[PDB]
Scaffold this active site. Structure first.
Site, PDB file in Angstrom:
ATOM      1  N   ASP A  96       3.429   6.262   2.787  1.00  0.00           N
ATOM      2  CA  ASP A  96       4.170   6.227   1.529  1.00  0.00           C
ATOM      3  C   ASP A  96       3.298   5.780   0.362  1.00  0.00           C
ATOM      4  OD1 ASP A  96       6.714   7.269   1.396  1.00  0.00           O
ATOM      5  OD2 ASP A  96       7.714   5.464   2.150  1.00  0.00           O
ATOM      6  N   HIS A 138       8.368  -3.426  -5.620  1.00  0.00           N
ATOM      7  CA  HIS A 138       8.288  -3.433  -4.159  1.00  0.00           C
ATOM      8  C   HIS A 138       7.004  -4.051  -3.624  1.00  0.00           C
ATOM      9  CE1 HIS A 138      11.973  -1.295  -3.751  1.00  0.00           C
ATOM     10  NE2 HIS A 138      11.524  -0.177  -4.292  1.00  0.00           N
ATOM     11  N   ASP A 174      17.124  -0.996 -11.056  1.00  0.00           N
ATOM     12  CA  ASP A 174      16.658   0.118 -10.234  1.00  0.00           C
ATOM     13  C   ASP A 174      17.707   0.507  -9.199  1.00  0.00           C
ATOM     14  OD1 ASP A 174      14.842   1.449  -7.939  1.00  0.00           O
ATOM     15  OD2 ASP A 174      13.599   1.362  -9.751  1.00  0.00           O
TER      16      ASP A 174
HETATM   17  K   LIG Z   1      17.766  -2.785  -8.235  1.00  0.00           K
HETATM   18 ZN   LIG Z   2      13.829   2.926  -7.206  1.00  0.00          ZN
END
Ligand SMILES: [K+]
Ligand SMILES: [Zn+2]
Ligand SMILES: CN1CCC2(CC1)c1ccccc1N(Cc1ccc(C(=O)NO)s1)[C@H]2c1ccc(Cl)cc1
Ligand SMILES: [K+]
Length: 385
Positions: A96, A138, A174
């Site tokens: 990824d 992330h 998000d």
């Molecule tokens: K979020």
């Molecule tokens: Zn996203």
């Protein structure tokens, strides 16, 4: 005064990734076509006096080994051994989050922008600062995830909470759970994180929901217990239901926490036109959930950082972030920014077909329990602190 991060170097770097391509260029250029730049202060990306100064800044959250590996990855892709593969695999720098000639320069640039924005807020040069090149929530301390290689958000917040009791409230709009920012501050009550997102079996990244007598909702640990708030929603939610869900939580968080700084991740993959096609939010303004949340946050009159994030429909992402910028100029400076329903002519005009309108081309047509849960947690957090 409203600031925005951009520059020559920043532009090419932000447009050098294989996943997001030229998205940053469309955003900045649409904002430019609408004659908003004259109303915004440019915040140049932060730079360092030596590679050692850069390392100390990035290793404030990431480990030296990971940063090392990311650096090597760029070198190798600019031209792999078995040991290299095991090394890359150990940091998730594969699949990824693959590498490319500019993988490190690209990741660092986001950190450069978000750090400059935080300093712009700290020295009070701008009451709000935008960075459509950041928001990679992330990224973990020693692990890339979801095409996030360095957590510009975490580093920015660290800078904010480090400045001359400072408390920072993080809001993640998000479509995906902001796990990276949430884990980094899991043990800290000084940084309250709130993420609204979709969650379901097999959906990335799998966190931000119940854990498994009956399910339990984790919300931090140690001195940071009750400091990580999460609201997972089912697919299909519209502008109204979404704003209604997050509305009271946003108000109550500002009331209880009284933040010194607000950091908003405004990823655009909640739009009804995103390829994921999970949420059905729009960018409309007469109302878009994104704008309702940003307007409510700006009403707090707290130094705020607005970051980018997800969004794979490039034109529509720029469609949304352009209005966020205009709305920010309206609230912060008090000068109305009447935008044209029609996309103005510019280099990327072709990409905005077939209707070439500012509104995204989409015709629109439980949470109660979570509110009681989140309220109880806020009371548990207020008392604990
Ligand atoms: K979020
Ligand atoms: Zn996203
Ligand atoms: C690899 N490395 C191991 C340690 C762990 C993840 C990363 C971590 C590192 C730093 C701070 C906290 C935490 N974790 C505790 C939690 C944080 C958020 C949670 C949630 O459920 N949110 O909704 S649980 C671990 C974790 C996180 C997610 C999972 Cl799935 C499993 C374990
Ligand atoms: K926290």
């Amino acid at each position: 005064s409203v600031g925005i991060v951009y520059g020559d170097q920043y532009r090419q770097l932000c447009c050098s990734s294989p996943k997001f391509g030229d998205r940053y260029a469309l955003v900045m250029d649409l904002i430019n076509a609408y004659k908003l730049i004259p109303e915004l202060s440019r915040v140049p990306p932060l730079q360092w006096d030596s590679p050692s100064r850069m390392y100390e800044a990035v290793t404030a959250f990431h480990s030296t080994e990971y940063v090392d590996a990311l650096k090597k990855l760029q070198m190798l892709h600019c031209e792999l051994t078995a040991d290299d593969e095991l090394l890359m695999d150990s940091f998730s720098l594969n699949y990824d989050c693959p590498g490319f000639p500019s993988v490190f320069d690209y990741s660092l640039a986001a950190v450069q922008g978000s750090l400059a924005a935080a300093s712009a807020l700290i020295c009070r040069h701008c009451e709000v600062v935008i960075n459509w090149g950041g928001g990679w929530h992330h990224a973990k301390r020693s692990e890339a995830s979801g095409f996030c290689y360095l957590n510009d958000i975490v580093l920015a917040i660290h800078r904010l909470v480090s400045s001359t009791q400072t408390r920072v409230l993080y809001v993640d709009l998000d479509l995906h759970h902001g796990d990276g920012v949430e884990e980094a501050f899991w043990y800290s009550p000084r940084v309250v994180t709130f993420s609204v997102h979709h969650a379901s079996p097999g959906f990335f990244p799998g966190t931000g929901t119940w854990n498994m007598k009956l399910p339990i909702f984790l919300n931090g640990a140690g001195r940071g217990r009750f400091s990580a708030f999460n609201l997972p929603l089912e697919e299909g939610i519209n502008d109204l239901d979404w704003s209604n869900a997050i509305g009271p939580i946003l108000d109550s968080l500002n009331i209880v926490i009284q933040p010194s700084y607000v950091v908003v991740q405004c990823g655009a993959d909640c739009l009804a036109t995103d390829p994921h096609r999970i949420f059905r939010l729009t960018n409309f303004y007469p109302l878009s959930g994104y704008l309702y949340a940003i307007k409510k946050i700006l009403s707090w009159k707290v130094p705020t950082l607005i970051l980018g994030g997800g969004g794979y429909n490039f034109p529509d992402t720029a469609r949304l972030w352009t209005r966020v910028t205009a709305l920010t100029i309206e609230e912060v400076k008090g000068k109305k920014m009447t935008i044209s329903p029609e996309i103005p002519e510019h280099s990327y005009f072709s990409r905005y077909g077939p209707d070439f309108e500012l509104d995204i081309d989409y015709f629109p047509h439980s949470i109660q329990k979570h509110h009681r849960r989140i309220l109880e947690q806020l009371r548990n957090y207020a008392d604990l602190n």
